[PDB]
Structure formats: C-alpha cells, structure tokens
Design a protein around this ligand. Structure first.
Ligand SMILES: CCCCCCCCCCCCCCCCCC(=O)OC[C@H](COP(=O)([O-])OCC(O)COP(=O)([O-])OC[C@@H](COC(=O)CCCCCCCCCCCCCCCCC)OC(=O)CCCCCCCCCCCCCCCCC)OC(=O)CCCCCCCCCCCCCCCCC
Ligand code: HEA
Ligand code: HEA
Ligand SMILES: CCCCCCCCCCCCCCCCCC(=O)OC[C@H](COP(=O)([O-])OCC[N+](C)(C)C)OC(=O)CCCCCCCCCCCCCCCCC
Ligand SMILES: CCCCCCCCCCCCCCCCCC(=O)OC[C@H](COP(=O)([O-])OCC[N+](C)(C)C)OC(=O)CCCCCCCCCCCCCCCCC
Ligand SMILES: CCCCCCCCCCCCCCCCCC(=O)OC[C@H](COP(=O)(O)OCCN)OC(=O)CCCCCCCCCCCCCCCCC
Ligand SMILES: [Cu+2]
Ligand SMILES: [Cu+2]
Ligand SMILES: [Cu+2]
Ligand SMILES: [Mg+2]
Lengths: 88, 55, 495, 196, 52, 151
C-alpha cells in the first residue's frame, strides 16, 4: 500500500481548516501478538506529521494567506502538506 | 530538580489551554472526509468516487 | 521439492519432540471429534423422524446399531483421551516442571502412531466393509460373539482396534509418571508441581491398573469368536465378561474427567489472577477420587442379578466417591470468588458452563447410585442424559476452556471473541435442549438404543429436534471460526 | 389413583426424599453463586489473599457426609424391602426371552398390529394380591424383563436363571420393554402383564 | 541505621535530596511503563479493560 | 532457517560434522551447535505473525487448498467414503428432508403436536394440519418410495 501523506484542507472564503488523510480499513478479525502496527496513515515516516500539525495549528487558526497553494478542483479548499512544519 | 522544573512549567502552560480548547476555526471531520472522497482520486481505483463505497 | 517433501514427512513421523507429538494428538483428537459428531447427527436424524425414516426397514436397524456403537467408541477413545491427555499432556507436562523432554522420548512417538494405527483400522473396518459391528459400545456377549449380524472379520478388527488403543494408553501413562517423578527441576518437590501434573499422574495410575483387565476381556471375546470356546456362551459367564469390562469401565470414566479438572484449575490460575483456593485440598481430592474409583465398578450391573449384599455395598461405595467431588466443586466456587477473571472471555463463560453442567450431571448420577432406584432407571434415557450432560457438557466445555486459552499461546494470534461467544452459547443452549428432556423421558420408561419409540414420547424428541438443529449451527460456526483463525483478511478499502 | 404395588411406593418415596435434598442443596448454591457473580461482574469485593480458610474447608467437607449417611441407609433398607417377599409365594411362572419375542409357560408372545409398539397378542397373567415367583432366563442372547412401574427390572441372561418375586395390587395391563440391546428387533419386543 | 540524632539529620538531608533527584524520577518512569504496557496490550490484542 | 555449516565446520570439534556430507539432513540428525538458529514450532506462523500476516492467504490457490485440506480434509474424505458405501442411507435422508417421504400421512388429516411437559398429556396437546397442502403445494403423497413394511 502506498497512498498520499496526510494533508490539511483550508477553505479561503470561510477561512476554516482541518487535517485529513486516507484511512485504510479491513474486515475485523483476530489480531497478531508479535506485531505493533507501523505508521499507516503516513507510510514510511517517523510520524512527524502529528508534530507538524500541532505546531501549525496556531499559524492556521490565526489566519494564513495561502494563495500560493494549489486548490482542490473548483472549490474554495487548498491543500497544505505536513511534510515540514508550517511557519510562513 | 529538572524534573520538578519541567513538571511545574507544564502545569502552568496547560492553564493557558491546548489547541483542542483554544482553536476556534476548525472544520468538522465529516465535512473534510466528504470533501476528500468527492474531489480527490481514490488511491485504489485511480479515479474520483462520488462517496464512500465498500467495494 | 523431493527433499522438502521427504523432510516434512520425516519431521512429522520420526519426531520425538513433546511439542510436535502434542500437536499431532490434538489434531487427531479434533478430527475424530468431528467424525463422531457427524455420526451423532445421523443418529439424531434417525430418532427425530417417525417410521424408520432413514433405514426404512426393520431388518436394517443394524445400521443404526452400528452408528451408536461407533459413535460411542469414537467419542470416548479417540476424542477425549487424545485431546485431554494426549494434547495438553505432551505439550505442557515437560514445560510445567522445567525440563526438555519426557522420559522415554521414543515411546511417545510409538504411542501416537499406535493411536493412528488404531484409528486407521477402525475407519477401514467400519466404513469400507459391509455389515459392521453393531453391538453397542459395551461389546456384551453373546451378542458380540454368537449373533447373525456380527459374523464378519471387521468385528474382530474393531476388537483389535481396542487392543491397540489400550497399548497406546499404557505407554503414555508410564511415560507421564516417569517424567513427572524424576525430571523436576531443583527446588520443586513432588507435591509442589502444579495441579495439572498431579492430575495427569493420578490419571496415568488409573490407566495402568485397569487396561490389562480390558485386554483380558477382549482376548476372551476374540477367542470365543475364533477358536469357538465357551467362555461367554449359554454354558459360559457373560456376567464374567461384564465384570471385567466394567472393572475397566469406570476407571476410564475418571481418567476422562480428571485431566479436565487439572486444565480448568491451571487456566483459572491464569485468567482470574489469583491462586487456587485450597490447592492442597484439590490435589488430595483428586487422588481420593482416583483411588475410590477402583471399588465401585459394579454399580453398572445392578440388574444383572448381583447378591443383595453386593448391591448395598456398591451403592455405599458410589456415595463415598460422590463426596470428594463435591469438595472440589465448592473449592472451584470459592476460587472464582475474590478473583478478577476477565468479564468478556469465552474461557470464563465456558468455565461457568463446565461448573454448572458438572454439578447437574453429578447429581443426576448420584441418583443412579442407589441400587433400588437403579431398578427403574437402568437402560433408559436417564442414563443417557446423565453421561451426556457430563461428557458432552463438562468434559467438552473444559476442553473448550483449554482451546480458547491455548490457541493464542500456541499460534500467536488472538481469538475472535464475538465469534467464539456465538459458538459456545449456541452449543450450550442446543445441547441442553437435546439431553435435558432425556432425563424426564427416562423416568417415563423410554428404553435406550431404540431407533423407534412409542407415541407417548413425542414431546421429548421434538425438543431434541430443536436441539439438533441448534447443534448443527454451533458446530458449523466453530469450524468456520477456526478456518477464519488461520486466514488473512479478505476485504480492505479506504475510509 | 392407586400405586400398583408397595415396592414401587417405597421406591417413589425414597426418590422424593432425595429430590428434596438435592433441590435444597441446589437452591443454597444458587443463592451463593448469584451473590458471587453479582459482586464479581461489577468489579467489587477483590482479595488476592483469600485463598485459604481452614474452618470453612473442614466444615464443607464434613457437611455432605452427614447428609449422605441418611440417604445410604434409606437406600439399603429400600433394597431389602424389595427383596423380602421371597418365599411367601404359591404360584410360579417361567419366562424365556427369545429373539424378539417372549415365552410364558411355553406360550409365545409377539408384537401385534392393533397397537403400534405397546400391545402384544399374548399377555402374561397374574392374580391380584397373590405373591408370584418369576423364573427368568433367555435362550439366545441377553434381554431384560423390564416392568419398572411395578418395580421389576431383571436381566434375562443365557445360562443364568434369575428369580424375582412379583406382586400386583391394581388390576389392569402394565406395559414394559426389553430394556437391553438384543439385535435388530430390540425396539419391538414389548412386555404385557395383566393383573386380574 | 542512624544511631544518634546527628546521623538522623544527615540521613534526612540525604533522603530529601534523593527524593528530589532519584526517587520521583523512578516513580514517574514506572508509571509511564505501566501505561505503555496497557497501551501495548490494547486495541484488541490482549485483555485490557476486561477487569480491574 | 539458513544452515549453520560454516560455524559448525569452523567450530571446536569439526570431526563431529564429517557425517554432514553423507546422506544426512542437517536439522534432524546432526549434532546441535552452540550458535545454531532457534527453531520454532509452526515456522509459517512464527515467520508471519511478526510481520502482521496470518500464515495462509486465501487469494493464493495453493494456500487455500492447503488450509481446506487441513481443516475440511478428513471430514470430506469420511463423508465421501460413507456416501459411496451407503448410497441408500443418504438417498433416504434426502427424501425425508425434502418432504418427499411420508410414512403413513393422509390428505386433510390432523396430527397431534406437543412440545414439552412430559409424555403425551391430552390436556396440553394441539392438533396440526399440513400447511404445505393447505397452501396447495401437495395434493397426493408419493408411494414409489421404500416403505418400512412390518413395523
Ligand atoms: C488426507 C489427510 C491427511 C492429514 C492432513 C493433511 C493436511 C495437509 C495436506 C496438504 O496438502 O498439506 C500440504 C502442506 C504443505 O505445507 P506448507 O504450507 O507448504 O508449509 C511447508 C512446511 O509445512 C512448513 O510449514 P509448518 O511447518 O509451519 O507447518 C504449517 C502448519 C500449519 O498448520 C496450522 O496452521 C494448523 C495446524 C493444527 C495442528 C493441531 C493443533 C492443535 C489443535 C488446534 C485446533 C484445530 C484442530 C484441527 C482442525 C479442525 C478444527 C475444527 O502446520 C501444518 O501444516 C502441520 C501441523 C500438524 C497437522 C497435520 C499433521 C499431518 C501428519 C500426521 C498425520 C496423522 C494425523 C492426522 C490424521 C491422518 O503440508 C503441511 O503443511 C503439513 C506437513 C506434511 C504432513 C504429512 C506428514 C506425513 C504423514 C504420514 C501419515 C498420514 C496419515 C496416515 C495414512 C495411512 C495410510 C492411509
Ligand atoms: C465423549 C463422549 C461423547 C460425546 C462428545 C457425545 C456427543 C453427542 N452424543 Fe453421544 N454417546 C456417547 C458418548 C458421547 N456422545 C456414548 C458413550 C454413548 C452410548 C453408545 C451406546 O449407547 O452404546 C452415546 C450415545 C448417544 C445416543 C444414543 C442414542 C440411543 O442410544 O438411543 C445419542 C442420541 O441422542 C447421542 C447423542 C449425542 C449428541 C447429539 C452429541 C453431540 O452432538 C452434542 C455435543 C457435540 C459437540 C459439539 C461435541 C463434538 C466435538 C467437537 C465439536 C470437537 C470440537 C473440539 C472440541 C470442542 C474439543 N449419543
Ligand atoms: C464422563 C464422566 C462421568 C462422571 C464424572 C460420572 C460420575 C458419576 N456417575 Fe456415571 N457414567 C458415565 C460417566 C461419568 N459418570 C458414563 C459414560 C456412563 C454410562 C456408561 C454406559 O452405560 O454406557 C455412566 C453411567 C453411570 C451409572 C449407570 C446407571 C446404570 O447404568 O444403571 C451410574 C449409576 O450408578 C453412575 C453413577 C455416577 C455417580 C454416582 C457419579 C459421581 O461421581 C458424581 C459425583 C458428583 C457430585 C456428587 C457432584 C458434587 C455434588 C455436590 C456439589 C454436593 C452434593 C453432595 C452430596 C449431598 C453428597 N454413572
Ligand atoms: C487393552 C490392553 C492393552 C495391552 C496392555 C498391556 C501392555 C501393553 C504394552 C505396554 C508397553 C509398556 C512399556 C513400558 C516401558 C518399558 C521399558 C522402556 O520403555 O524402557 C525404556 C526404553 C524405551 O525408551 P527410549 O528408547 O526412549 O529410551 C530413552 C533413553 N534411555 C534408554 C537412555 C532411557 O526401552 C528400551 O530401551 C527397550 C524397549 C523395547 C520394547 C519393545 C521390544 C519388543 C517389541 C515387541 C516384539 C514382538 C512381541 C510379540
Ligand atoms: C410464566 C410463563 C412461564 C414460562 C413460559 C414457557 C413455558 C409454558 C408453561 C410451562 C408449563 C407447561 C409445559 C409446556 C411447555 C414447556 C416448554 C419447555 O421448555 O419444556 C421443557 C420442560 C419440560 O418439563 P415440564 O414442563 O414437564 O416440567 C414439569 C412440569 N410438571 C409440574 C407438570 C411435572 O419445561 C420446563 O422445564 C418448564 C419451564 C419452561 C420455561 C423455559 C424458559 C427458558 C427458555 C429456553 C429456550 C427454549 C426455547 C423454546 C422456544 C419456543 C417458542 C419459540
Ligand atoms: C484396589 C484394587 C482391588 C479392588 C477390589 C475391590 C473389591 C470390591 C468387592 C468385590 C466383590 O466381591 O464384588 C462383588 C462382585 C460380584 O459379586 P457376586 O459375584 O454377585 O457375589 C458372589 C457370588 N457368589 O465380585 C466380583 O466381581 C469379583 C471381584 C474380584 C476382585 C477383583 C479385583 C481386581 C483385581 C485386579 C486388579 C488389582 C489391582 C488394581
Ligand atoms: Cu461407573
Ligand atoms: Cu430383546
Ligand atoms: Cu432387547
Ligand atoms: Mg443393561
């Protein structure tokens, strides 16, 4: 499995943000004792996106001029990646 | 001790609050998930799905 | 891949590792349990419907008699003992006393493969061959020797199956005693070994003392059939055969039951996070039950014509044996108290079912101990209710406790608790509907080993019909759960 | 409603006494288990130290014993009460269990078509209030003469002549069975006794 | 074991320092270890939350 | 797992491993070595669990067949042998379970029905008519089937 790393939606006119990502899921059954699940939302990562989201929350809620970010289709939402902490 | 200093600093910090308590502008997760499915290509079918489908 | 195939075959045939022999015993036991269950379903379908709906002819009731006899033999000698004693006995006994192997590593493999030889002979004799043995699981002469429906060789093959199973059990018993007596690690005394080892030791002592007598009885049957002697003929002593067989018969019963007590005690220590209440008391009660079981054999022959003094004596001895089991039941009830057993565990609920069903079966069987009252209950459905609400609800549920406790440990995958809940609860409810009515159909006079019954007994068989459908559902659930246990996911998408 | 004999009455009364005892014990344990389970499931009353109590263990071992000697004595007396009426008879009857039919004084009795499984063409007749001796055996294999409503169930074993004492008080027909596997037609080998 | 009062005062001072610098860290580390084990045996792998 | 032969040869008493170049398997009949790999009970499960995988995958035909044989193998072998040797028993069972066989049932009759409460007690029983023929699915009962005469 290899999907996109978690991102942050941000709506401009409304000025409202929120994290998002792809959640894998499967039919429930017995587990495995010798296995702690790896990072599945952010594959092949040390799970820093949580820290980046926590750090960037103050930046985003305070009001960010994200005109330099791509949009999502024809809506008012733009995607901010959580690869590195957001300062702007 | 450094442990005592850190504990006291954290205790004072949480009085101010945490993002889950202080953040005002924040969308519900259902709206975000619906937007994800309605606009972005599925990572399996490589196309845009209307909504959530089991198969 | 020739080398790989031969290596696997050598791994599972030349082995002497107690773990591998234990898993093999467990596999064979589960398979034979399923076969016995299928035959039981055939029997039940014969009983539920009216008018010999399956055999269609009075002359062909020999098929039904063959079904009951093979059901009994399969479920007693190849289901419980291989599982209760063979599987956990081999897998755990060396580990619980801190040692590598059992004493006599080769005799362990010899035991398992003797069991397999017996199963093979039995399966070939009673399926591929015509007109098989149809004399009930207690092969009473002259029915099993001087009859018309029992003339083929496959009957003698079934008797030899009994012989091989006896040999296997004797070897296993000697091995268990020897390993537990000398290989204990330093600092562990004989009476400080955990409860399961002690119960296995006493079970082994039981098997050693009685199996030679069963061998003598079976050799008597074979000699009567083949060389045409008269040990058990109109000028012989069929009662002598009954005495010998039943001298083996009851020790076999306590051999079956005690290891279940040991396993339940061990698992309880593991899941309630507390020690056994009166561990020394339980161990002494186990040995008491073992010893007292050698003096009660003739409570299965109260109508044969025994002397009046002997009837009274055997009723007394049966009550004596009844006492210490009550002590053990109270000890269990107090053990569970004050503990922190898991509130959502199939092991916990199976323990509850085991306790309740064993108490009820013990009471019903204590009614049958009285010689006088055994006049009205011998060879009715009361006896069937008794030994099925003990065997199929106390021994089976103890093995379910062990199964749901040791699957994660052996395989390293947790258990699907909701699935197991459905299985265990439907097994409980279905089985109760099948056997509980039998009790009140025994007090009403219905004899046993009859494919056709009088019209007075319809309600009991209707409730049995209900129970049989629930049993089919439960066993399918169980098998499908196990198949799901070792199978990876089948659905996965993005949410 | 009559009893049909005195031995059956004695057995019934012993059965009722044991039933009362076992029901009392079951009720006591049910109350105890209800308290224990109700405390447990709510995560109350935990004590890992409570794994021994000498007094309680000794008492709970003693109690079943005293309540069991009474049952044993009652059962023994019931047995001997069954067996006393021997020797006070004036009629003898001999019974042979053939392969799927019975023989009384050299008269054969087989199942009939008027009744499904219960009725027989030739019953066995005994007189009311008259003590009789049944000498029972079998020719081919083991059967079991079973009339449990009169308190009679004795195996007919080849080469072994059993001897039971039968007595009737209520006039009518008692239906019984073979109560021992004997072959294909084991389920169709009924017994009919007429007390007149 | 402190015998005279001076040794008692010395032992008390040492114990206060050790409590500030060695014992409370041990307590917090052990508490974190217990909670980490509880989290490890959670999520459907073990019997966490069934009792206790 | 992988053989330990290099260590065994460079070990401390290599003369004990000369037999290992004869017709001899390493795991079963060779002297164990201080540095041997640890062998587990169910190697498939042991290698699959730490990776989060159940040992058998249903998508692979070989694995599906192997697991079927492990769980349902002897059961179906016994069933097939029984059906081959007793074709008439299963034929009769199929007839009865499909309502094709009726012992002596008539048309339009009522039959006793009681669930429990001990033996037949006239104060508790009901009488039932066949819903199949009430609807109309049944008009006559087949007679070509085997009939237990003399019962
Ligand atoms: C016909 C049926 C024969 C018996 C059943 C065979 C099933 C497998 C068939 C198959 O195609 O297997 C390919 C399959 C190939 O393996 P693989 O997946 O490629 O992996 C390679 C290695 O095996 C590496 O994998 P591994 O070492 O990890 O093993 C995988 C693991 C996978 O296993 C599991 O995951 C589950 C195993 C459960 C074992 C029991 C545990 C305790 C109970 C738990 C509850 C389950 C109960 C059972 C199921 C019912 C549930 C309701 O274990 C096994 O597969 C074997 C475990 C032991 C069970 C089978 C024993 C067979 C030999 C003994 C025969 C006598 C007894 C049976 C009656 C005959 O074979 C095996 O895995 C088994 C090894 C070979 C066994 C045969 C050895 C020779 C036996 C000779 C005597 C035969 C009987 C007498 C005949 C006399 C003349 C008529
Ligand atoms: C341990 C022994 C054992 C077990 C398990 C059973 C299980 C069952 N038995 Fe039977 N039975 C006997 C021992 C046993 N029996 C004996 C000795 C006789 C006398 C033979 C004779 O009279 O000569 C007898 C006779 C007997 C009769 C006699 C009919 C007649 O005499 O008139 C009937 C019919 O109702 C019957 C029914 C059943 C049913 C419906 C089940 C089961 O369907 C109910 C419980 C089912 C279970 C589900 C158990 C199956 C096990 C597996 C599922 C393995 C899975 C793994 C584990 C859980 C460990 N049994
Ligand atoms: C499977 C295990 C098992 C166990 C544990 C037992 C336990 C007992 N059994 Fe039985 N039995 C069988 C398996 C078992 N049995 C089988 C398979 C048959 C049929 C063989 C066949 O015919 O084919 C059989 C048949 C059988 C008969 C045959 C009746 C007849 O055929 O004529 C009799 C009668 O004496 C009997 C008696 C007992 C007694 C008195 C106990 C006692 O051990 C029970 C003791 C239990 C307790 C007493 C519970 C504890 C009670 C309390 C909590 C306190 C109450 C105590 C007092 C008031 C004293 N059993
Ligand atoms: C229904 C009744 C059934 C029959 C019941 C009657 C008994 C049936 C047979 C039971 C056998 C019980 C054996 C008990 C132990 C015997 C001693 C033993 O194992 O010693 C250790 C060993 C076996 O254990 P081992 O090989 O693992 O040894 C471990 C390693 N040492 C030696 C260091 C301890 O025995 C021997 O070395 C010799 C045993 C030979 C046994 C068979 C030889 C003859 C086979 C039959 C020939 C043809 C007959 C016709
Ligand atoms: C207040 C309501 C009482 C309970 C309602 C159900 C029972 C109706 C009245 C009982 C007395 C008359 C007997 C007739 C019916 C008995 C049914 C029965 O189980 O008999 C067995 C047994 C047969 O024993 P019995 O009925 O002979 O009891 C002895 C009766 N005397 C006093 C006359 C000797 O019945 C009982 O034990 C009676 C109580 C039954 C209550 C069952 C509750 C638990 C349900 C478990 C699942 C059962 C599934 C059934 C589903 C049916 C509908 C979908
Ligand atoms: C401990 C192991 C031994 C246990 C012995 C227990 C003895 C109980 C009472 C024995 C007895 O007499 O039981 C009655 C029974 C049948 O009595 P019945 O034949 O009717 O009366 C005499 C008729 N002329 O009598 C019999 O059936 C005869 C029994 C004889 C004793 C056999 C004991 C077993 C011997 C082999 C194993 C020994 C070691 C274990
Ligand atoms: Cu017994
Ligand atoms: Cu008969
Ligand atoms: Cu008969
Ligand atoms: Mg009998």
């Amino acid at each position: 499995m290899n999907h996109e790393r978690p991102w942050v939606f941000l709506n401009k006119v409304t000025g409202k943000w929120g994290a998002c990502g792809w959640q894998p899921f499967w039919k429930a059954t017995s587990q495995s004792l010798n296995y702690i699940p790896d990072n599945f939302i952010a594959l092949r990562t040390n799970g820093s996106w949580v820290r980046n989201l926590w750090q960037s929350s103050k930046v985003l809620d305070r009001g960010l001029n994200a005109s330099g970010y791509p949009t999502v289709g024809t809506t008012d939402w733009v995607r901010i990646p959580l690869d590195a902490p957001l300062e702007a | 001790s450094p442990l005592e200093k850190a504990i006291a600093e954290i205790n004072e910090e949480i009085k101010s609050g945490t993002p889950w308590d202080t953040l005002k502008n924040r969308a519900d997760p259902k709206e975000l998930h619906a937007l994800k499915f309605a606009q972005l290509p599925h990572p399996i079918t490589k196309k845009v799905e209307g909504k959530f489908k089991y198969f | 891949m020739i080398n790989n195939i031969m290596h696997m075959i050598n791994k599972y045939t030349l082995t002497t590792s107690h773990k591998i022999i234990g898993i093999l015993y467990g596999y064979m036991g589960y398979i034979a349990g399923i076969l016995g269950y299928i035959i039981s379903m055939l029997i039940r379908m014969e009983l539920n419907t009216q008018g010999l709906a399956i055999v269609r002819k009075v002359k062909e009731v020999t098929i039904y008699n063959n079904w009951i006899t093979i059901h009994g033999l399969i479920m007693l000698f190849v289901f419980i003992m291989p599982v209760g004693i063979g599987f956990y006995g081999n897998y755990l006994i060396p580990m619980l006393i801190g040692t590598s192997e059992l004493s006599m590593p080769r005799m362990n493999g010899i035991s398992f493969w003797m069991l397999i030889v017996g199963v093979v002979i039995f399966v070939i004799s009673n399926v591929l061959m015509s007109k098989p043995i149809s004399s009930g699981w207690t092969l009473y002469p002259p029915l099993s020797t001087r009859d018309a429906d029992n003339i083929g060789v496959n009957i003698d093959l079934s008797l030899l199956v009994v012989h091989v199973l006896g040999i296997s059990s004797t070897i296993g018993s000697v091995n268990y005693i020897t390993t537990n007596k000398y290989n204990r690690h330093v600092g562990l005394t004989f009476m400080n070994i955990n409860i399961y080892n002690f119960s296995i030791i006493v079970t082994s002592i039981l098997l050693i003392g009685s199996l030679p007598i069963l061998g003598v009885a079976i050799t008597g049957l074979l000699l009567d059939r083949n060389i045409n002697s008269t040990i058990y003929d109109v000028i012989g002593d069929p009662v002598l055969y009954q005495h010998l067989f039943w001298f083996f018969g009851h020790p076999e019963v306590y051999v079956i039951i005690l290891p279940v007590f040991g396993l339940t005690s061990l698992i309880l220590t593991s899941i309630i996070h507390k020690d056994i209440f009166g561990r020394e008391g339980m161990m002494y009660c186990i040995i008491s039950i073992g010893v007292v079981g050698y003096f009660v054999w003739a409570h299965h022959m109260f109508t044969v014509g025994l002397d009046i003094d002997s009837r009274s004596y055997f009723s007394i001895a049966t009550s004596i044996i009844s006492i210490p089991t009550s002590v053990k039941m109270f000890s269990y009830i107090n053990t569970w108290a004050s503990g922190r057993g898991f509130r959502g565990n199939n092991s916990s609920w199976s323990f509850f079912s085991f306790l309740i069903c064993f108490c009820f079966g013990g009471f019903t069987g204590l009614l049958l101990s009285s010689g006088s009252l055994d006049i009205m209950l011998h060879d009715t459905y009361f006896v069937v209710g008794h030994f099925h609400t003990v065997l199929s609800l106390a021994a089976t549920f103890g093995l379910l406790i062990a199964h749901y406790f040791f699957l994660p440990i052996i395989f390293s995958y947790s258990i699907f608790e909701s699935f197991s809940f459905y299985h265990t609860f439907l097994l409980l409810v279905g089985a109760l509907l099948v056997f509980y009515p039998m009790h009140l159909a025994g007090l009403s006079g219905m004899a046993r080993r009859v494919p056709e019954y009088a019209d007075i007994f319809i309600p009991f068989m209707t409730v049995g019909f209900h129970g049989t459908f629930l049993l089919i559902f439960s066993t399918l659930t169980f098998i499908r759960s196990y198949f799901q246990f070792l199978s990876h996911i089948n659905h996965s998408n993005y949410l | 409603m009559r009893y049909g004999n005195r031995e059956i009455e004695s057995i019934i009364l012993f059965f009722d006494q044991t039933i009362i005892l076992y029901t009392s014990i079951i009720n006591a344990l049910i109350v105890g288990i209800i308290i224990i389970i109700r405390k447990w499931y709510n995560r109350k009353g935990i004590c890992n130290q409570y794994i021994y109590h000498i007094k309680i263990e000794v008492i709970w071992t003693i109690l079943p014993i005293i309540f069991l000697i009474v049952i044993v004595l009652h059962s023994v007396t019931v047995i001997y009460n069954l067996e006393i009426n021997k020797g006070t008879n004036n009629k003898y009857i001999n019974v042979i269990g053939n392969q799927w039919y019975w023989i009384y004084n050299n008269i054969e009795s087989r199942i009939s078509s008027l009744g499904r499984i219960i009725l027989v063409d030739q019953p066995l007749f005994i007189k009311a209030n008259n003590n009789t001796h049944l000498i029972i055996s079998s020719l081919d294999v083991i059967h079991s003469f079973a009339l449990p409503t009169l308190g009679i169930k004795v195996d007919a074993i080849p080469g072994r002549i059993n001897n039971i004492s039968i007595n009737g008080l209520t006039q009518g027909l008692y239906v019984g069975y073979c109560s021992e596997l004997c072959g294909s037609g084991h389920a169709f080998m009924p017994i009919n006794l007429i007390v007149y | 074991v402190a015998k005279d009062k001076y040794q008692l005062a010395k032992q008390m001072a040492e114990f206060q320092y050790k409590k500030s610098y060695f014992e409370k860290p041990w307590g917090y580390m052990f508490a974190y270890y217990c909670d980490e084990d509880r989290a490890r045996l959670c999520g459907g792998i073990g019997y966490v939350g069934h009792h206790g | 797992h992988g053989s330990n032969l290099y260590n065994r040869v460079h070990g401390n008493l290599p003369q004990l491993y000369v037999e290992q170049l004869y017709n001899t398997d390493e795991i079963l009949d060779t002297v164990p070595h201080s540095s041997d790999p640890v062998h587990h009970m169910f190697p498939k499960c042991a290698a699959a669990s730490p990776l989060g995988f159940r040992p058998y995958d249903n998508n692979k035909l070989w694995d599906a067949f192997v697991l079927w044989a492990i769980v349902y193998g002897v059961t179906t072998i016994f069933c097939v042998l029984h059906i081959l040797k007793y074709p008439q028993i299963w034929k009769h069972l199929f007839e009865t379970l499909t309502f094709q066989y009726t012992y002596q049932r008539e048309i339009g009759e009522e039959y006793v029905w009681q669930y429990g409460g001990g033996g037949l007690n006239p104060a508790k029983w009901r009488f039932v008519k066949s819903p199949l023929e009430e609807l109309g699915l049944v008009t006559e009962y087949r007679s070509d089937l085997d009939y237990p005469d003399d019962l």
